[PDB]
C-alpha cells in the first residue's frame, strides 16, 4: 500500500556538561534504517537495516556530513531560542525536528512534512501546501518572517517532491523482502479470575508488522470503548509489535464478549472469543 519516510532529530542542551547532545534516526514505515549520535566515539551515520548496507561510501560520507552540519545549526538555534523566549543560559532545553514524505501505492507523493518543536511544544510547521507556515507563537513568528524572506519553503518543497519520493522508491525496492511484507498478528484470548464475581478477558495481538492495528471488545455487539484497557502498541525487538485490550467481565458473561482485530496483514477482520 502506502509508505512513508521520516527523519527524526533531537538536540538537548546540558550547560556545564559540554555541548548539546544530537541524536537523529531515519525510518521507512516502522523500520529503523539509519542512526547518528554526536556522543558516539567517532560519530558517523550508521546502518540499521540490511537493505541500506549496500549504499556505497559516497552515501555514508554525504549523510554523515549532513548530520554533523545539522548538529551544529541546532546548537546555534538553541542559543537563538534562549533569546526569543527571554530564558537563562542555566537550564537544559530541547529542539526537535521531523521531516519526510508519504507516498501512495503508485509511488506518488501524498503529502510532505517539515516541523519543529522547542521544549516539547509545537514551534513552527510547514503546511500541507509545502508553501506556507503555521507558527505557534510570537517567537516562531520571528522565524516565520526570516524563512519567508529567504524562501525556505521553496527549498523544502523541492526536496519533499523530488529527492524524498525518489529515495523512498529506491529503499522500497531494495528492501522489498521486508518493507513490502505485512506480518499478521498472532491472536488469542486469556482469562484472569479477579474475584468470585468477575474476571479479566485479555485479547492479544502478537508478532505483527506494521505497527498500525485495531483491537476492540464488544458485548452483545456493542463497543466497550470506555470499559476497555488498551495498552500502547509496543516493540517486541524482532521488528514486530505487540498489543492487548482487556475488559472486566462478570461471572458467566464471557460468551457475550467478542474481540475484533483489524490489521493490513489480515485479508478479513478477525473475531475471537474466550475458549475454555
Amino acid at each position: 500500500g502506502s509508505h512513508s519516510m521520516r527523519y527524526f532529530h533531537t538536540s538537548v542542551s546540558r550547560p556545564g556538561r559540554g555541548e548539546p547532545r544530537f541524536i537523529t534516526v531515519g525510518y521507512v514505515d516502522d523500520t529503523l534504517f539509519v542512526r547518528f549520535d554526536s556522543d558516539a566515539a567517532s560519530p558517523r551515520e550508521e546502518p540499521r537495516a540490511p537493505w541500506i548496507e549496500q549504499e556505497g561510501p559516497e552515501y555514508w560520507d554525504r549523510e554523515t556530513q549532513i548530520c554533523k552540519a545539522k548538529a551544529q545549526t541546532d546548537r546555534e538555534d538553541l542559543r537563538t531560542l534562549l533569546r526569543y523566549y527571554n530564558q537563562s543560559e542555566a537550564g537544559s532545553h530541547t529542539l526537535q525536528n521531523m521531516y519526510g514524505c508519504d507516498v501512495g501505492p503508485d509511488g506518488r507523493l501524498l503529502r510532505g512534512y517539515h516541523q519543529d518543536a522547542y521544549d516539547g511544544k509545537d514551534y513552527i510547521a510547514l503546511n500541507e501546501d509545502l508553501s506556507s507556515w503555521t507558527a505557534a507563537d510570537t517567537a516562531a513568528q520571528i522565524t516565520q518572517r526570516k524563512w519567508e524572506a529567504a524562501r525556505v519553503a521553496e527549498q523544502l518543497r523541492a526536496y519533499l517532491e523530488g529527492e524524498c519520493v525518489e529515495w523512498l522508491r529506491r529503499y522500497l525496492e531494495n528492501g522489498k523482502e521486508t518493507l513490502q511484507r505485512a506480518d499478521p498478528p498472532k491472536t488469542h484470548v486469556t482469562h484472569h479470575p479477579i474475584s468470585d464475581h468477575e474476571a479479566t478477558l485479555r485479547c492479544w495481538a502478537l508478532g505483527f508488522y506494521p505497527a498500525e492495528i485495531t483491537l476492540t471488545w464488544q458485548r452483545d455487539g456493542e463497543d466497550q470503548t470506555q470499559d476497555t484497557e488498551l495498552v500502547e502498541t509496543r516493540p517486541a525487538g524482532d521488528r514486530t509489535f505487540q498489543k492487548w485490550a482487556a475488559v472486566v467481565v462478570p461471572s458467566g458473561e464471557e460468551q457475550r464478549y467478542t474481540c475484533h482485530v483489524q490489521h493490513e496483514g489480515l485479508p478479513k477482520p478477525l473475531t475471537l472469543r474466550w475458549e475454555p
Partner: protein
Amino acid sequence: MIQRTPKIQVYSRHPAENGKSNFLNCYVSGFHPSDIEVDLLKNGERIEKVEHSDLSFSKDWSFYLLYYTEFTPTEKDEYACRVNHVTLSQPKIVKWDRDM
C-alpha cells in the same frame, strides 16, 4: 516548562516459558523532557549490560525508548523495570508479569 510522565510497560519478546531463553523489554514512552534512567532488575538487583534503542519521538513530540536484555524466565525469579524521571518524586518500579 511542560512535563509529561512516562508510560512504562515491562514484557517479554515471546510468550514466557520456564527454562527457555527470551528477551526482557522495558518500553518507556510518552515522556518529556528526554532525560530518563531505566534499570532492569533480577530479584531486586540491577542487570548488567542492558542495551537500549536510540532516542526518538511520537507524532505528539513525546519521547520513547526501549531497554532490553536476554533472560531465561523461571518459576521463582522476579524481574522488574525501575524508572526515574523528573516527573517522579521517587523511582517507579513495575514488576514483570508474564500475563501482561
